[PDB]
Amino acid sequence: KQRKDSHKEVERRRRENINTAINVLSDLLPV
Amino acid sequence: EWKKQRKDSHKEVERRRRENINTAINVLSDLLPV
Amino acid sequence: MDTEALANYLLRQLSSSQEYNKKLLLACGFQAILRKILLDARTRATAEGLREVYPYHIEAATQAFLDSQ
Amino acid sequence: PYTWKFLGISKQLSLENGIAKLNQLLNLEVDLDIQTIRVPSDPDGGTAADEYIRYEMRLDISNLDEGTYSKFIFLGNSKMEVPMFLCYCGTDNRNEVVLQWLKAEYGVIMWPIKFEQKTMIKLADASIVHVTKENIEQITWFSSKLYFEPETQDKNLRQFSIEIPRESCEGLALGYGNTMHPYNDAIVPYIYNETGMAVERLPLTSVILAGHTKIMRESIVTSTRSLRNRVLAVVLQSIQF
Amino acid sequence: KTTLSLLYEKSKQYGLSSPQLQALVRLLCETSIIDTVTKVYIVENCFLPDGYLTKELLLEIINHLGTPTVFSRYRIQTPPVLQSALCKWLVHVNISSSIWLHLWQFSFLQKWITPLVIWQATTPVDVKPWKLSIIKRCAMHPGYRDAPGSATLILQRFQCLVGASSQITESIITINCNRKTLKSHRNLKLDAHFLSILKRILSRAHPANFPADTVQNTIDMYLSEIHQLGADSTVSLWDVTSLEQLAQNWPQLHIPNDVDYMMKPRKVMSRDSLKHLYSSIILIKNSRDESSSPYEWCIWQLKRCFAHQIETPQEVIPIIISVSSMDNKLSSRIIQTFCNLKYLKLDELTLKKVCGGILPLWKPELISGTREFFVKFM
Amino acid sequence: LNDGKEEPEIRRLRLEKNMIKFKGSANGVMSRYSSLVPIEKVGFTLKNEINSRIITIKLKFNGNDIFGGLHELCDKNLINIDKVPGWLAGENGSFSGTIMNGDFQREQ
Amino acid sequence: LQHQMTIMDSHIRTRKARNKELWDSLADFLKGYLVPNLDDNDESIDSLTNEVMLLMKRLIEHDLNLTLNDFSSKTIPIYRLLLRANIITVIEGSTNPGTKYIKLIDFNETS
Amino acid sequence: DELMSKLIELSSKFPKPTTAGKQVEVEKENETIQELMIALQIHSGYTNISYTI
Amino acid sequence: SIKPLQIMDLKHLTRQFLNENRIILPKQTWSTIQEESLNIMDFLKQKIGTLQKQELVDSFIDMGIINNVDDMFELAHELLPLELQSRIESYL
């Protein structure tokens, strides 16, 4: 019936994945 | 114009910032054993 | 297809030279209606900015045309 | 991304002869630029052989229309065989109307520009080198990658590439020492030094820098505002016999 | 139908003369009592050209090519399928160019007129902006599927002919082309089986002049030209197009300097015949001297071959040989400059073919300096 | 690097050297350029330590027979046959990974 | 060259003649064939033809004032044929309803 | 050589290379009239369309 | 039913539209247009009953497709080849 997806949406998801990976890496840092 | 020069400077700064992250993560991946 | 095929379909639905010409004119009007509906739907989609047009624009345009006429 | 079309000149011509009579055929104003600078072939000193003359003008009124923008950049000598060449970017009628006007004016005939491996690699050296307002030369580096497309039967090996991180580029030039030609002594031999392939003998398709230039034999592509001076000079020597 | 069947065999064996072709097509278009399908078959098969059709025969076909309109009270009725087949046979076989384009806009003729308008147009004067407007009109107006592909072909032919105008791409962008018609309109119907009968009829009738085998070569010239684009008076040297017209303005003819355009290889005579005379024109317009631009061009292009700057070394070698045969004062510099052994190292093969074709022609000029220089070469 | 016509006997021996390092024997274990097992894509990564820092070079190959293609280029004198390494010659083929200290490591 | 010297030793009239010939051949075509083929109003050729010369002179001058409306029904089939002639148009008109507007480009213009 | 000498002499013998508006307007009018006659004759399917100059 | 146009019929209609002006439309819109084309066939049949020239002209004038018989044969000329409109202009 309807399609709910886009090339714009998936790239945002990948960017958020990279950002949260950076965040979890920085969590272990002392400073 | 002045706006075009400002845009070019912004683009150069953005490219340098993008490349710095790649260099840092390359160094990190070098440090990893796996 | 062709407007001749549309006129043939319309005369099949209804069931000489003047009758065939009337069928041709009615098929031309149907073509104009369809073109207007498609243009309205595409204008709505481009106003939104979707990558692909979706059936709800088509439904909205068709319902607006039906209610207006 | 701006694509540059290259082109040569048979004998030295004078271009400022009639800017008033170059406009009525075209029906809008065109300006003039007269400019000459030093091009040090050797930092220690430079003879009279680097004496270069450069012209530049455009054909436009609309600054908003960035797409319909073209420039004709001239540069060359007057003592060697081929005096000068020319380059332009964009596709329009303005890129040729003047071109016929000096087609039948001076008697110089044009020819496409040919690049091969002896020249293609050395262009990136002039692209990466920088000059400041105090005549101090420092190099801005870029992660170069090469494109190779070898002709073969069965298409067993049709395309392969070599990529070098340019921090490793930094580690190569420093090992050799302070060099004015980094690709003579740090990069090109090192590929032969390890893998044993000769870059120059092999058919090279493209040399790509990291977001600065895009070098291919058919045409040179650069995202900068305007081309530099060392690039034009090295092109001139390369097309010289 | 028995008489028509006898006519088909008689027309097949004995061909059809140009007066016969126009008389038959006039009678065929005059009456519509016979079936429409057999009228198409008559033009496609029963019609047999001899050589190339005359202008009057083409004009009579133009009269019958007109699509039926509301203005058909006094005109002789003609089916659109017959009109399409009438021009289809024309594919098999300045003012004329305008006639075809006004006929091309019709839906049933655009697929067959398109080759005809290209053939008749060979000069930039025939290219006019209002013609391009009609072309793009027929392109954009819907219901004409074969128009936009054929429109692009005529657009490209007109743009390449004039050589100086606004870009026609905007007139192709505003129109929709699937490019399947453009490929079809680019191709010309060979009709190989029809070609043998055409050969025998041209050998038979009527005057044994203007043979269509030469026209077939011109058709191949037409075919090559179509494919490449799809995929007294004071005038310049190239503003002239006829040899006779060149003689009248010769005392007042000025030559612009586009050298290799002289050297690098129908209603009005083709340009190819002129360029053979163009080389001799410059040889007589300017006396043999070192300042002649074509003579300097020969030296420059020769150096390109030695340094391999040219795309292929042998492209200009035959041209240099013909030009350098004369001019003893400038034939020496062809040898004196290039007889040094330094040029031999760069390319020994290229030196051989230019050395062997010039030395027999050359005359001694230098009393001294030239025996030893050549002895050094040996 | 710098370059005379080779003797036919010397020409034959020079052509034999190329086949030894890509096929393993003068006759060949297996036209002549086809290898025992053709492979499509192999991407190597070479890391070496020079002046207390790491120099990385990445090589990516694509085609029908990668090691067959390299053999032909060595026949045309484009690539020196003496200096090609083991991994480029076909050793541990169909496996792409990082190389250090002369040791090949498969990709994780 | 020798023949040219022999000529040396030893235009405007045809252009005016062509102008009279083309003008005469034009009016004859309209009255002789075009108007009878129009067959409007029981073939009243004299009344139909008079509008044809005015429309022709407007077309010869390439006037842009031609319109479906503001004209007699006699001229419509000639003008409707011009619409079907595929030589003149731009789009359907909007200022005057029920009419597809026309445009005509000058024949004398050369790029 | 002698042919070139004679032809150079002949060329030197020749001169050096170098209502009108009403006539140009008449020619333009003739072009327009012939174009429009050809167009209309083709539109109407006339049986006597000929070359017009 | 049988009357609503298939995907290829709408593709050809939009090819004519593209000839008029380049317009892009997707696939599922064709099925939606087929359903609404059955609906619009019902709409037009109730809009145009027994076929009379004046009746059809009035119906299309009311629908906004045309403004008069002038626009009738003008649209016919726009959407169709020459001979059919010669017939139409003879009829109209």
DSSP E124-184: GGG--HHHHHHHHHHHHSTT-TTHHHHHHHHHHHHHHHH-SSS-THHHHHSS---SHHHHH
- Give the residue extent of every domain in chain D: 1-241
Gap between the Cα atoms of D96 and D90, Å rounded: 11
- Which residue of chain I is at minimal alpha-carbon distance from G78? I89
Rg over CA atoms, chain G: 21
CB C45 within 8 A of CB C54: yes
Contact I81 E142 (CB under 8 A): no
Secondary structure (DSSP) of A1-31: ------HHHHHHHHHHHHHHHHHHHHHTS--
Residues of chain E positioned with their CB less than 8 A from the CB of I22: 174, 176
Resolution reached, in Å? 3.7
Distant-in-sequence, close-in-space partners of D189: CB < 8 Å, separation ≥ 6: none
Gap between the Cα atoms of E285 and D14, Å rounded: 26
C-alpha distances out from residue I39 to G1, I5, I31, I35, Å: 84, 12, 13, 6
SS3 letters across E290-302: CCCHHHHHHHHHH
Mutating which of E165, E166, E295, E300 best tests the D interface, going by the most D Cβ atoms within 10 A?
A: E300
Gap between the Cα atoms of E202 and E193, Å rounded: 15
Mutating which of E67, E69, E70, E105 best tests the G interface, going by the most G Cβ atoms within 10 A?
A: E70
Contact F80 D192 (CB under 8 A): yes
Query: CA torsion, points E291, E297, E302, E304, in degrees to nearest 10?
Result: 120
Secondary structure (DSSP) of F73-86: HHHTTSB-SSS--H
Closest in I74, I86, I89 to G100, CB measured: I74
Closest in I22, I78, I86 to E141, CB measured: I78
Structure tokens at C68: 């207006």
Mutating which of G33, G57, G109 best tests the H interface, going by the most H Cβ atoms within 10 A?
A: G33
In angstroms, the separation between the Cα of residue I14 and the nearest Cα of chain G is 18
Which neighbouring-strand residues pair with D7? D86
Query: CA torsion, points D44, D48, D49, D54, in degrees to nearest 10?
Result: 110
- Which residue of chain H is at minimal alpha-carbon distance from G106? H32
Gap between the Cα atoms of F6 and E373, Å rounded: 34
Amino acid at D228: R
Residues of chain G positioned with their CB less than 8 A from the CB of I86: 84
**How would you label D16-39 residue by residue, b for 16+ Cβ within 10 Å and e otherwise?**
eeeeeebeeeeeeeeeeeeeeeeb
Contact D114 E309 (CB under 8 A): yes
Which neighbouring-strand residues pair with D74? D55, D86
CB I68 within 8 A of CB C2: no
Please report which residue ranges of chain C form alpha helices under DSSP H: 3-14, 17-48, 55-68
Secondary structure (DSSP) of E107-124: TTTHHHHHHHHHHH--SG
Mutating which of D167, D168, D222 best tests the B interface, going by the most B Cβ atoms within 10 A?
A: D167
According to DSSP, residue D156 is labeled S
In angstroms, the separation between the Cα of residue E171 and the nearest Cα of chain I is 12
Q: Which of residues 38-97 of D touch E (CB under 8 A)?
A: 81, 92-93, 97
Establish if D63 touches chain B: CB-CB under 8 angstroms: yes
Phi first, then psi, for residue D54 (nearest 5°) are -130, 135
Gap between the Cα atoms of F43 and F60, Å rounded: 4
DSSP E strands, chain F: 41-49, 54-62, 98-100, 103-104
The β-bridge relationship of strands D145-148 and D159-163 is antiparallel
Q: H or E stretch including G79?
A: helix G75-84
CB E162 within 8 A of CB E182: no
Closest C-alpha among E159, E151, E142 to residue E185: E151
Residues of chain E positioned with their CB less than 8 A from the CB of I92: none
Closest C-alpha among E87, E89, E115, E185 to residue E144: E185
Which neighbouring-strand residues pair with D208? D145, D214
Q: H or E stretch including E59?
A: helix E55-65
Q: What is the largest CA-CA distance in chain A?
A: 52
Establish if I36 touches chain E: CB-CB under 8 angstroms: no
Question: Quick one: E348 exposed, middle or buried, by C-beta within 10 A (0-12, 13-18, 19+)?
Answer: exposed
Gap between the Cα atoms of H31 and E95, Å rounded: 9
Q: In degrees, to the nearest 5, what angle opens at C-alpha E341 toward C-alphas E336 and E344?
A: 105
Closest in E106, E176, E178 to I82, CB measured: E106
Gap between the Cα atoms of D12 and D135, Å rounded: 30
CB G51 within 8 A of CB G31: no
C-alpha distances out from residue G14 to E96, H23, H26, Å: 20, 10, 10
Residues of chain I positioned with their CB less than 8 A from the CB of G68: 70, 74
Gap between the Cα atoms of H30 and F57, Å rounded: 76
Please write down the long-range contacts of G6-14, taking CB distance under 8 Å and 24 or more positions apart: G12/H19, G12/H23
Gap between the Cα atoms of E359 and H35, Å rounded: 59
| Expt. technique | cryo-EM
Residues of chain I positioned with their CB less than 8 A from the CB of C50: none
CB D123 within 8 A of CB D234: yes
Contact G98 I73 (CB under 8 A): no
CB D144 within 8 A of CB D208: yes
CB E72 within 8 A of CB H29: no
Contact C54 A6 (CB under 8 A): no
Gap between the Cα atoms of A19 and E129, Å rounded: 59
